[PDB]
Amino acid sequence: PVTATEIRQYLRGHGIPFQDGHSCLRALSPFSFSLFIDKTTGHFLCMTSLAEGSWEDFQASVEGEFEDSEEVRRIWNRAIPLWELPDQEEVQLADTMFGLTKVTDDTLKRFSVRYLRPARSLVFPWFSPGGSGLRGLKLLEAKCVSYEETTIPRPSAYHNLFGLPLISRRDAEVVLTSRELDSLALNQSTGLPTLTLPRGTTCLPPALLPYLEQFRRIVFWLGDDLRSLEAAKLFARKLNPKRCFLVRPGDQQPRPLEALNGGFNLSRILRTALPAWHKSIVSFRQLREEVLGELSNVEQAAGLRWSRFPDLNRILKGHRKGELTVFTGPTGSGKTTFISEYALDLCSQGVNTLWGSFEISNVRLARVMLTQFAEGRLEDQLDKYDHWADRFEDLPLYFMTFHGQQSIRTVIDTMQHAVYVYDICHVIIDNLQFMMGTDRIAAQDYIIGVFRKFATDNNCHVTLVIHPGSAKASQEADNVLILQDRGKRYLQVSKNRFDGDVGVFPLEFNKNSLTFSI
Amino acid sequence: PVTATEIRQYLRGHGIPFQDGHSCLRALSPFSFSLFIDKTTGHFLCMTSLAEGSWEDFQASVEGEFEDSEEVRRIWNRAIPLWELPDQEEVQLADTMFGLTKVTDDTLKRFSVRYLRPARSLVFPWFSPGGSGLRGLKLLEAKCVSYEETTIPRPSAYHNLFGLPLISRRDAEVVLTSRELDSLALNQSTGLPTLTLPRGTTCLPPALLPYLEQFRRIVFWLGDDLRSLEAAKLFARKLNPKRCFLVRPGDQQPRPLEALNGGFNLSRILRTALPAWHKSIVSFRQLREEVLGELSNVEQAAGLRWSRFPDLNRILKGHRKGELTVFTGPTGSGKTTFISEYALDLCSQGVNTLWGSFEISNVRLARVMLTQFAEGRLEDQLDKYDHWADRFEDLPLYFMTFHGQQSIRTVIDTMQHAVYVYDICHVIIDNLQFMMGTDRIAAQDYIIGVFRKFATDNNCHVTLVIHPGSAKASQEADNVLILQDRGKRYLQVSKNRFDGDVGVFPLEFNKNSLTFSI
Amino acid sequence: PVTATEIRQYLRGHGIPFQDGHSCLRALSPFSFSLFIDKTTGHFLCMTSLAEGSWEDFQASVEGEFEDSEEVRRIWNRAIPLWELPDQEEVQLADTMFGLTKVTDDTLKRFSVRYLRPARSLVFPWFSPGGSGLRGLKLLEAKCVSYEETTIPRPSAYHNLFGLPLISRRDAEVVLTSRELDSLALNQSTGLPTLTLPRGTTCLPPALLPYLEQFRRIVFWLGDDLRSLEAAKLFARKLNPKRCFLVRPGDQQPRPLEALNGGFNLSRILRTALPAWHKSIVSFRQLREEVLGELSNVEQAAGLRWSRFPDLNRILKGHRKGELTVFTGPTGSGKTTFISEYALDLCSQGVNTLWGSFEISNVRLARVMLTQFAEGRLEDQLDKYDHWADRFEDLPLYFMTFHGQQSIRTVIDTMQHAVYVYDICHVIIDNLQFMMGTDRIAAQDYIIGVFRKFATDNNCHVTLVIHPGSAKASQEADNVLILQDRGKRYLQVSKNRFDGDVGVFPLEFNKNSLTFSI
């Protein structure tokens, strides 16, 4: 709830000379403008003092922390660099499975890419911004051709930008890659500075924003799918899209790793980058690639495909961004368990989800959702609980804890804050009456319009569950889901913004596994 | 009705330099910042002058007390220190009943733990903050394994923090314990400073807050039950939860006394303390312990169990915090006696209750409630009245006296003030019409919403008795209780927020003992 | 959303001395008044520094770009000047096809008109304002007598004013010509300075306005049709019509190229130019030519004739300027495809069109409109896609991208901004309900009146498609189009402002080509 003007006037209180630089303001550090203040969160960070915290921490600091030490040097010491391997069969097998046929040993030395023998996996080190020891390791394993990502520490704390020590202060152009292998190929040929997102197209933590402040031109290259382009656009809004460019996906525009392997020239691809910022009026030139992609990716024109609800997939046909849907049904039918299952299935595919359930006792909700993840009854499997707990704490999944605050204004800024900090791509609220907290009809209409305004402006998909349909709700909402009863129930959809397809299908619910089936 | 800004400007009137320190502001004492002013009550207290009083007393002091002397030194002189006992059988029996097998004699000397021979009970002394003589003694007796608590003077005035002289000014970390024996074990192993609450998880008087101002990190450890965690959270709100941490209860997280006896490492338990302050958005990491506890303590998921209303227990299933319930019934059925019985039974289990009865002549109400405590007729037992009077004046039970004030705003701040000063966990108001004080319907709806807002924000359970049901009351309220007549009556519940269970059961009322039965 | 006063006060902030000159203010360049600031867009441009950008760029420039290099010198080197050709048959054939019988070799040397041998086409060079190398080439080819226009680079970026180096600073009179050959004849006889519009009567980019600031008297001569006169009037509003004059079309007032060839005196035509600015009251003197033209051009009294809807042409009889029409029909009839076809057919004749479609996913709309341009199915013709893409990116066609903005005020200024920047002569909005976002009826009436006010004031034709006719809409609107169903549909018109002709005709829609037929 702190605006940029409030940040500026607070700095003027201490008389600290600050310069408005892109996203995070730069000023001389009181504890050459090393001090950086986040525009939206006020999270301070110094390039020299290396101090981080909240805005309230900064306020208390002018009046009058972490080590992250883990047994990770052992893994580094027990792994051999790829370019220092005298073996012939081992290295040839290594590049074939990881697609490193065209990767030269010079790039390996520059990026310090290491290889581990016990599991035959790549090693991607994390270097401290201050030149200290290793901060973490990222491991990629090839299985069959599928790549498995494993990192130490947990992915929620993994904030490594590959090539950060390599890039210099005199560099203004940087290209971001969703993976790390494609970054090696991109730097090998173009030679321009490049960086990799921590968890790919999952999310971009704001802590990494100050490191990218120096660059003036930024080109996004995060895959070869419409989902990657949408993820790039969300990332663009954080970094003042007036200073960044995009590379549209296409048949002739593959990923940098495949482009070098396939022999296609990548300099032309980088040259045809289109601006991510547009005026209120645009021409067809900035849309030629998008229309071509939709013409050959009609399956990608919609959202992701659910792996547990084929019947829902054949009617809704996807889960887009910005669209708002409303779910409703009679009480006592467990309409709160289904939405947890619906969110969990989408969450398993790499979608950021946020839970703002009210009057549900979210502690109990976490238990129900975890049982759904286990696809069974966890009471009997209490012995094997740590294994599923570790698997549970790697998906993008977050919860909202409101103790006394219930106003509509309060929840909006917190939801907006959540999107900025963790790239929340999906928000679900269980009870809307608790937010309240002809008057009831008018109040219900007002809050629904606010959510529709928030969903459209922020492009984040929002799902509202209604506890007793409401007047004027259908016009504002894009989709409707009704779970009626006849533990057997059926879902009926009578409004589809994207497709205009309606229908109804039955469902079978089992309390043993808390998972619906048909 | 005095805000923090009003406190600050009043200090600026005299020009006293004050520093905003956590909860109670620190300033130089005019009668090194010894003077402390409470944020909510303004109760001044000096570390050197040792002067206490109300905010109005402070205002009158700048313009122009107690001794608490009791025959308690006799008990101390007639008791022998545990570490100075040459007997062998006596000391071995003493530790077995009190669970002091692993307690070393060095800890006994440090804490000056004494033992009394006539009744075989522990002695816990109270030391004055200024280094004066003893202020009180706390006695714990083991009977069968049950511990009985007896203190001199009365528990309402017992404000002793065990280990207060022991802790130094250069200590920033303190762990609070609900008992005293576990504090001895905690200090024996960890060696970190620790303190004990006066009456355990009952309440924390604000007078003890300035003594804890010096510490920056505070860890709560008040038992191994969900009730203890809830009590810790209420205590956290008083002491700026941004500077305190919590230890969640669990099977692998026992009390410090049992942890040392059981051999479990306690350093790990202290290391995994989770912050008591959270943002508006949280992840699953800060909820792993809570969901595990609810999975193995399903009986503790609800409130306490009544010892006198099994029929009410089988439907309501508990008495939670923050939930609001409304009681109603026809006049002349003695609906005011039942609520006194309902509060008294919960009060007997260690729950703070406040009475704001209007148009009931609370002096008469005290007589009725006391007769219910005696479980019979006190008219015949007038000879044995002092014994029950002493037993009556040790439960947490308080009353509200409103002579002329009837406005809704006035009662809200007084109720809020009562919670801050004595940890009021339950508020009951007999008559709502007296507070008033289509107009009547609108006024009744407004005040009910205010109570619901107050109950939810402060997490204090509030019960309203309605004197003739009301429109729009069911939606705002969480539970409904109706006492209809057919001195035989029956209670019907048609709304259960926590469980959704409804029913109706008869009751038999006897005027001889003023206690309902079935 | 920046007014002229805001521009003036911002300049006063830096203390830059600025002089209010006609359209674009003149001031001393900080990076003799070389700096020019656009009144409506603030697009800065310096005659010496040669720096261009947006108003926000100017704001950021005071705190603390393009090359357009193409292989065009090869074409110039491979072409021979017309006056340097020793051939006799070739030059005689060249002038007969291009109508250059009366053109003298002296004019060719002065304007540096070149001729290319491989395709037998004229060459019109583009010179940089700073005297640098060639910026572009315009090619005119004669085929049978029809002239084909081809320019390098794309017409959207062609901003060449023929004769700009030739005209001096001491010239106050300039005559604008829609073509280039007529400019050569006009300068040959009159000898007065003259310039040519980049794409003729299509549009006048604001970037060319500062170059015409020096001239005080401007005479428009853009053809011999009522459309040319209307286009001249729209151009007049941009350049303060108080300083410009018009030449009315007529039988005795042909184009300058034909006037010299036909032997008619052109000095008299230039002398009888009428002012383009009039008071609120006028006499018949300034209307004698207009009434004569309408008397002999009754076919030109209305708008253009559609080349794909003869049935619609026989009833509506044309597409005028300033008139507002409303289109409506039942959903699911593809009423959004027809309006794209209607706009595309008019766009193919040289009419600037703007798309502000809402809830249509304009990226998909571009695909549908492009398929209509191909007059068939592009899925099978994906191999021959670049050829149609190049043909698609030369018509005047623009789109509006609104992500979160939906207010009526926002869309009005953007539409007004679009007209100023690109001479938008046609605006079509697909969904009006999305702009919203008895109250609905009042809101719908208000926005329709705003569009009617905008259409009448700006003389731009606006078409609104209504998604369910509305009350009070017929009175404000000028024409109504209804597409009912009985994929066969029929269009009914029941209101014609210009003609008063009503009727209804059927239509046949084919999904293979997405083009209606009868």
Q: How far is CA B376 from the centre of its chain?
A: 28
Residue in A283, A291, A292 nearest the CB of C398: A283
Give me C12's structure tokens: 């006063």
Q: In angstroms, what is the resolution? A: 4.5
- b/e code A72-92 from CB counts within 10 Å (16+ = b): beebeeebeebbeeeeeeebe
C-facing residues of A in 481-500 (CB < 8 A) are: 497, 500
C-facing residues of A in 448-477 (CB < 8 A) are: 453, 456-457, 459, 475
Residue in C367, C399, C433 nearest the CB of A282: C399
Residue in B280, B281, B291 nearest the CB of A363: B291
What DSSP character marks residue B30? -
Answer whether A370's CB lies under 8 Å from A401's CB. no
Does B401 belong to an annotated binding site?
A: no
Query: How many C-beta atoms surround the C-beta of residue A431 within 10 A?
Result: 17
Place of tokens 């019960």: B463
Cβ separation A392–B459 shorter than 8 A? no
Q: How far apart are CA C509 and CA A438, in angstroms?
A: 47
Query: How many C-beta atoms surround the C-beta of residue A121 within 10 A?
Result: 21
User: Terminus-to-terminus CA distance in chain C, angstroms?
Assistant: 46
Counting one residue from A and one from C, how many pairs have CB atoms under 8 Å apart? 60
What sign does the CA torsion over A24, A26, A27, A30 have? Answer: positive
C315: part of which helix (H) or strand (E)?
helix C310-316
Q: How far apart are CA C288 and CA C293, in angstroms?
A: 9
Give me C292's structure tokens: 């004569």
Contacts of A414 in chain B (CB under 8 A): 280-281
C-facing residues of A in 63-92 (CB < 8 A) are: none
CB neighbours of C270 closer than 8 A, spacing ≥ 6? Answer: C175, C190, C192, C219, C247
Does B177 belong to an annotated binding site?
A: no
Task: Please report, for residues B63, B227, B286, C426, the alpha-carbon distance to residue B458 in angstroms, rounded to integers and kept in the order given.
Answer: 36, 16, 22, 61
Query: How many C-beta atoms surround the C-beta of residue A34 within 10 A?
Result: 17
B79: part of which helix (H) or strand (E)?
strand B79-81
Answer whether C190's CB lies under 8 Å from C273's CB. no
Does C396 sit behind a cis peptide bond, omega within 30 degrees of 0 on the bond before it? no
Method of structure determination: cryo-EM
Determine how β-strand B121-127 pairs with β-strand B134-143: antiparallel
Does C303 belong to an annotated binding site?
A: no
CB neighbours of C5 closer than 8 A, spacing ≥ 6? Answer: none
Does C334 belong to an annotated binding site?
A: yes
Max Cα-Cα span within chain C? 80
Q: How far apart are CA C196 and CA B204, in angstroms?
A: 89
Does A335 belong to an annotated binding site?
A: yes
Answer whether C160's CB lies under 8 Å from C135's CB. yes
Backbone dihedral angles phi then psi of residue C223, each to the nearest 5 degrees: 135, -165
Q: How far is CA C183 from the centre of its chain?
A: 19
SS3 letters across B240-281? CHHHEEECCCECCECCHHHHHHHCCCCHHHHHCCEECCCCCE
Q: Do chains A and B touch (3 or more CB pairs under 8 A)?
A: yes
Within B253-374, where are the H helices?
256-262, 267-271, 288-296, 310-316, 335-347, 362-374
Task: Please report, for residues A330, A491, C404, the alpha-carbon distance to residue A474 in angstroms, rounded to integers and kept in the order given.
Answer: 18, 17, 20
Cβ separation A418–B497 shorter than 8 A? no
Q: How far apart are CA A294 and CA C196, in angstroms?
A: 41
Name the burial class of residue B141, with classes exposed (0-12), middle (13-18) and buried (19+) by CB atoms within 10 angstroms of its CB: middle
Answer whether B491's CB lies under 8 Å from B457's CB. no
Task: Please report, for residues A13, C175, C203, C309, C348, the alpha-carbon distance to residue C342 in angstroms, rounded to integers and kept in the order given.
Answer: 61, 35, 21, 8, 10
Give the nearest chain A residue to C57 (CA atoms).
A242
- b/e code A196-235 from CB counts within 10 Å (16+ = b): bbbbbbbbbbbeebbbbebbeebbbbbbbbbbbbbbbbbb
Answer whether A344's CB lies under 8 Å from A307's CB. no
User: Terminus-to-terminus CA distance in chain A, angstroms?
Assistant: 46
CB neighbours of B332 closer than 8 A, spacing ≥ 6? Answer: none
Q: Do chains C and A touch (3 or more CB pairs under 8 A)?
A: yes
Query: How many C-beta atoms surround the C-beta of residue C390 within 10 A?
Result: 10
Q: How far apart are CA B502 and CA B316, in angstroms?
A: 8
Q: How far apart are CA C283 and CA C463, in angstroms?
A: 34
User: Terminus-to-terminus CA distance in chain B, angstroms?
Assistant: 46
Instruction: State how far residue A280 is from chain C, nearest Cα, in angstroms.
Output: 6
Determine how β-strand B244-246 pairs with β-strand B217-221: parallel
B509: part of which helix (H) or strand (E)?
strand B503-510
